[PDB]
Design a binder for this molecule. Structure first.
Ligand SMILES: Nc1ccn([C@H]2C[C@H](O)[C@H](COP(=O)(O)OP(=O)(O)[C@@](F)(Cl)P(=O)(O)O)O2)c(=O)n1
Ligand SMILES: Nc1ccn([C@H]2C[C@H](O)[C@@H](COP(=O)(O)O)O2)c(=O)n1
Ligand SMILES: [Cl-]
Ligand SMILES: [Mg+2]
Ligand SMILES: [Mg+2]
Ligand code: NA
Ligand code: NA
Ligand code: NA
Length: 326
DNA sequence: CCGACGTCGCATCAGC
DNA sequence: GCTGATGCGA
DNA sequence: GTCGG
């Protein structure tokens, strides 16, 4: 990409701040600057040129000048050499190991893939499954495989109850040619913002997908969110497909547009859009858009009849999902 | 200068 | 058990 | 780390 060296550098800094420094606002700031630079349609010639973009300030402009001049950033050259940061950054690549657990594992002398496998009983359930599929979860999913997965999920959901609607969101809904995982939004007319007239609505779908051996493992599961593992079936003599991460979110049916806006993302798009909502006097979550009083307290939910209704409230022109890959 | 930075589900733990 | 952080994830 | 009041 046009500015890929710069955006990779800022992403690596973002990850350092999240995983090692445990500085969540610096993580978000670096990711915001990387995103706005990734969409900038010119090859950046200087830090000052980048500083014009919102989210790029003085410090990143200086790093961009060092990176343009040398092809490298000394700050990151040193981070790469620090064994503690190297260890923590590896360990946090296991699903379920976050910055806190990674640093505690390092204190205990658990710092390598071999150390983790030797100490499975020091892992919670999520982490144990993250370790099992460590290699698989860094592989990307071709859209062609996403389409096969979509067919299975949609048809199995229809067999449980033809009134379910499952919608694949995430980068797939933004039209990406490959995805890191599969995100499924689920609705049923029995579950609305006003009542839950039938229990186990998510459970029944999960159990059906386990029954046909599509869902293979569970990371976490509650009444409205499933986080787990799935796998396409392979044909005779074929090597098996990698196991994939799957997330299923059951959303009140009358709140589908706020739910599908949220689950379509990207994550940075959502942060930018919700931050703009706040500046406009609204707050948006996956359920509603509500006004803010002078209070600072959220009012009653506003009527939403399309994704574009949400954009309208905050005075944004509509952006199709394919234009939300921030 | 400096307060705010998106919003929330599930797992886990501490305190009572 | 309940409640309220905290961690980790979407 | 950046921004806006
Ligand atoms: N911090 C987050 C993370 C996710 N999300 C929402 C938006 C996003 O599209 C996301 C789906 O989560 P995921 O991490 O799978 O993000 P994707 O957009 O699907 C992806 F592009 Cl990173 P992919 O999963 O395809 O690699 O849920 C969010 O709002 N905030
Ligand atoms: N998972 C879903 C997807 C769509 N829908 C409903 C919301 C709208 O009334 C209707 C329109 O379909 P679509 O917008 O997906 O073209 O589908 C739902 O209730 N649950
Ligand atoms: Cl709400
Ligand atoms: Mg995804
Ligand atoms: Mg602000
Ligand atoms: Na700027
Ligand atoms: Na992790
Ligand atoms: Na996901």
């Amino acid at each position: 990409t046009l500015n890929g060296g710069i955006t990779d550098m800022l992403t690596e800094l973002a990850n350092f701040e999240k995983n090692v420094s445990q500085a969540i606002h610096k993580y978000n700031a670096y990711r915001k600057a990387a995103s706005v630079i990734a969409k900038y349609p010119h090859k950046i010639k200087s830090g000052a040129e980048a500083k014009k973009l919102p989210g790029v300030g003085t410090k990143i402009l200086e790093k961009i000048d060092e990176f343009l001049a040398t092809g490298k950033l000394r700050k990151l050259e040193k981070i790469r050499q620090d064994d503690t940061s190297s260890s923590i950054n590896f360990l946090t690549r296991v699903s379920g190991i976050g910055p806190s657990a990674a640093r505690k594992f390092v204190d205990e002398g658990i710092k390598t893939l071999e150390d983790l496998r030797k100490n499975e009983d020091k892992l919670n359930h999520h982490q144990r499954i993250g370790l099992k599929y460590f290699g698989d979860f860094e592989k990307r999913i071709p859209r062609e495989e996403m389409l096969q997965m979509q067919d299975i999920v949609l048809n199995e959901v229809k067999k449980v109850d033809s009134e379910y609607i499952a919608t694949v969101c995430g980068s797939f809904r933004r039209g990406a040619e490959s995805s890191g995982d599969m995100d499924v939004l689920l609705t049923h007319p029995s579950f609305t913002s006003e009542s839950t007239k039938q229990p186990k609505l998510l459970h029944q779908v999960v159990e059906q997908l386990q029954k046909v051996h599509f869902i293979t493992d569970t990371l976490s599961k509650g009444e409205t969110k499933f986080m787990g593992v799935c796998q396409l079936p392979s044909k005779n003599d074929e090597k098996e497909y990698p196991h994939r991460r799957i997330d299923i979110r059951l959303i009140p049916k009358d709140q589908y547009y706020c739910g599908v806006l949220y689950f379509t993302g990207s994550d940075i798009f959502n942060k930018n859009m919700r931050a703009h909502a706040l500046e406009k006097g609204f707050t948006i979550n996956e359920y509603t858009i509500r006004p803010l009083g002078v209070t600072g307290v959220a009012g009653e939910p506003l009527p939403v009849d399309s994704e574009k209704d949400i954009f309208d409230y905050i005075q944004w022109k509509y952006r199709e999902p394919k234009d939300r890959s921030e």
